[PDB]
Amino acid sequence: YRPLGDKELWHEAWMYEDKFGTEEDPIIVPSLEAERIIGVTDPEDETLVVWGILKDGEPPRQFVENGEFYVLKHVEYIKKVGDVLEAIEG
Amino acid sequence: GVSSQFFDAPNGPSVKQVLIEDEWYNRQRSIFPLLDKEPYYPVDVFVAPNAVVCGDVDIYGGASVFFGAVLRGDLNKIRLGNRSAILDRAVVHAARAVPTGLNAATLIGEKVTVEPYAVLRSCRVEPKVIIGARSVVCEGAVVESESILAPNSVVPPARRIPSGELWGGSPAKFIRKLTDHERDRVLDDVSTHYHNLATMFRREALEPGTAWRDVEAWRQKLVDQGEYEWINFREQKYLMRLQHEAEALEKLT
Amino acid sequence: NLAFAPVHRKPDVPVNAGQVVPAPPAAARTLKIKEVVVPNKHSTAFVAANANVLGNVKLGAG
Amino acid sequence: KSASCYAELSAIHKFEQSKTFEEQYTESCIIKDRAALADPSNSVHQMWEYDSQTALVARAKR
Amino acid sequence: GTERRPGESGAWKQIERQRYASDWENDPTFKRTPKNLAEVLDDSASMLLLTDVWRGMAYTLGAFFDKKVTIMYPFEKGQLSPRF
Amino acid sequence: XXXXXMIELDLCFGLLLLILFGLLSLRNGHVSLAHIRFICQCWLVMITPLEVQDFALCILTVVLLQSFHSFEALLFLLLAYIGQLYMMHSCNLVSFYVCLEAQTLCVVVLCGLLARGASTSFSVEAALKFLLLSAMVSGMALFWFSAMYQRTGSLDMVGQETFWILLVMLFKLGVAPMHMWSVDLYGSIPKSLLLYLSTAPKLSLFTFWASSWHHDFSVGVFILFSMFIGSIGAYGQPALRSLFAYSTINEIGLLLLAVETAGFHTLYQHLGIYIITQLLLWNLTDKRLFALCAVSLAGLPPFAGFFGKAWIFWHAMSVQAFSLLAAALFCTLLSLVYYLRVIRLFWTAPVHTAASFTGAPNQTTLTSACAVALAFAPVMLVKPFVI
């Protein structure tokens, strides 16, 4: 997990994960539904945004070139990071 | 076997120490003191950013230290004369003692030029002398003024170099007599040439530069994350000194 | 900070002085670097900040 | 003797080199204040006694 | 009383210490700080206007009007015992 | 009504506030007092009247305050400047004596305090010598002042007794043969205090002379003493300090010569030029400009010293003072020898300047380079300017 200082406590991290999603180890996106829109910036340009749609039960998918891979996972609760796991401070 | 810590430093002991393998960007200083031995350089000195200078080193006049050169005056005092040329990646060193019995300090006279890749250690270099590349003068040897040393020449310890002559070889030997014009101007010619180059480099000195911005940005990010740490070096040093005094006094009786 | 810089883990080259270490995840995900070999340096040893030490190097204690 | 003396030199150079930037700036400021205290006629010297290593008042003189 | 005060210490190390460190406050044997106008006036009456000399003065003055134990030798002698 | 005397009350209030402020600043463990220095400069600005001489002395002192760092010495300099400024306003010998003695005591104290190193002992000895001779001169002045007070029964500075007032005025400028105290002071005291001495009391005394002094005598023989002795000594003394001391003696002799023939405009301009040069002198860090001071003192044409001596010679000829004019010419010639010697000593030499280590990197570049711009002055100077 990235440093949670200057992060709002309700931003639901997984976005603040310390990992670069690869093909053999994607970043698992939690979702309350079978599909969800996420936004990924260009690794070579912070100003460029590509919005994509991940679907439940799919292979790893890359949105921008030379970007992270992603896999959606349907969950019933998303850890609202800032008082869920840093109050745990495990 | 000496601890890397100094409680009796002229400035106090360092509280937090950082591992070199933990360094993510180089922090190499060109000039820095050695305990209570401090540098002495002219206001218009040319020091290449990749040069190495430390401690009790004397430099006079329009002398120059060029890229990657080393002047490590840790074991003795080092003196550099007026308008003396030190080219790239040369070393001026010294020892604690010499068989000759004189001062082990390495002396360089004024208007003395040094080609790249030279090792100077505990030698007296009279003014107006040329030093060749891949050439070394050992401890206790003396080079008289108005002399030219060929490159790839070895000067053994405690040897003498008579003036007005050209010498060279491994070991060094007589070659030919320097002409009167060579004594008159040529040495000073090389001195002025390399001093002009050094001042040319000094003209475009953008010091201290702007590369600190990125490091400042990273520190500012740590501040936003709050992980950047505050430490009073003064009071922590006072506590460390008191701890040293207490622990030392608690072990005599 | 190139005093401690990696080199390429090659198949034929026997690593006996340095030590293989995993590459940072960015290097692997970007330009296919899985194993890198960094010097095995004793903590008591000292290296200047301007040297060029890379890869399969062992430094003795002190 | 070379082994021993250069081991000592390596230790001293590691000590000098392993210092943080903020600590070096602190040292520079301490040197500045010490030179400011090199004046025998400094007004503070009949009231405040400073530490040599830290340029901070340890006790009053009178 | 047996209480102590800042400035009433007869030394330099202790005086310099108390005027530059509050260590005496942690000591319970030092009289605690006044907290109101009444206590400040009490402290002023303690320091100024004496009020400490006055008691011993009065006791000595009462001793002036008091009896004595003086004997008129050789016309008077002391008390002794047979074991003398 | 006291409504017309507000500024003196302001001086007193500001001194009291400065005392309390300096006391409070010292309890904090502060080690530098540049804030105190700027506050003192501001207070000097406010207490200054609107006279050209007053402002000149004020600004001269204002620049000089950058060269000191101890609160007490700042206070002493402030009080000495007060005495000087009020000496420019002294209409009677009582205030004149008080101002002279206050300035003398301040000078003695300042010389005594700021010593450091092994030089301290010689500074103390020179300061005590100056104190003793100042005390005897002050007693002489008081004696003759009392005699005049008896004869006239008034506060007029007239009569035969004024000759000794003239003598006492001479003693304060180091008028040879009452010059040797200046030489002794040049011998040991650090450069900042000597920098002060060469400018301020001389300026104030010349102004007070110009405003409220007349006498029925001459000073020409003393002018001869000063000129000849200073020239010969500055030629013969290998020590740089004594060299500049005897140079100052010769210059004050030149100023006295200008005085004797009236025409105080040239006196004023030459005093200003010499004070500029002295300001440039004692704050030097590079030695290349050091010869410029000599050429501005040796009367070499293109710079201001030459013209400053030149109008003086013009006014001396305006009264056909042939004797002292010829003497001044010969002494000007004799100056050139040791001035060229100075040039050789600090021009035909390898260039070297030490770098600062405790910060304060060449802390006096600005005033130095500003005083250097004197070659541009003669443009405005050649016209009838100072008059």
Describe the structure.
Chain A: One of its GO terms (cellular component) is mitochondrion. Chain A: One of its GO terms (biological process) is mitochondrial electron transport, cytochrome c to oxygen. Chain C: Belongs to the gamma-class carbonic anhydrase family. Chain C: It is found in: Mitochondrion membrane. Chain C: It comes from Chlamydomonas reinhardtii. This is part of a larger assembly, with 1 copy of chain A (90 residues), 1 copy of chain B (253 residues), 2 copies of chain C (62 residues), 1 copy of chain E (84 residues) and 1 copy of chain F (387 residues). With 90 residues, chain A is an all-beta fold. In chain A, 0% of the residues lie in helices and 36% in strands. Chain A has a 3-stranded mixed sheet with strand order 1-5-4, with no helix packed on it. With 253 residues, chain B is an alpha/beta fold. Chain B has helices at residues 180-203, 212-225, 233-249; strands spanning 31-32, 46-47, 52-59, 64-65, 70-80, 85-86, 91-93, 106-108, 113-114, 118-121, 124-125, 129-131, 135-137, 142-143, 147-149, 154-155, 160-161, 165-168, 173-177. In chain B, strands 1, 3, 5, 7, 8, 10, 11, 13, 14, 16 and 17 form an 11-stranded parallel sheet that branches. Chain B has an 8-stranded mixed sheet with strand order 2-4-6-9-12-15-18-19. The longest helix of chain B is centred in the last third of the chain and has 24 residues, at 180-203. With 62 residues, chain C is α+β, with helices and mostly antiparallel strands. Chain C is globular. Chain C has one helix at residues 25-31, and strands at residues 7-8, 19-22, 35-38, 40-41, 58-59. In chain C, the strands form 2 sheets. A 3-stranded antiparallel sheet of chain C has the order 1-3-2, with no helix packed on it. In chain C, strands 4-5 form a two-stranded parallel ribbon. Helix content of chain E is 39%, strand content 0%. Chain E has 4 helices and no strands. The longest helix of chain E is centred in the C-terminal third of the chain and has 12 residues, at 53-64. Chains in contact: A-B, A-C, B-C, B-D, B-F, C-D, D-F.
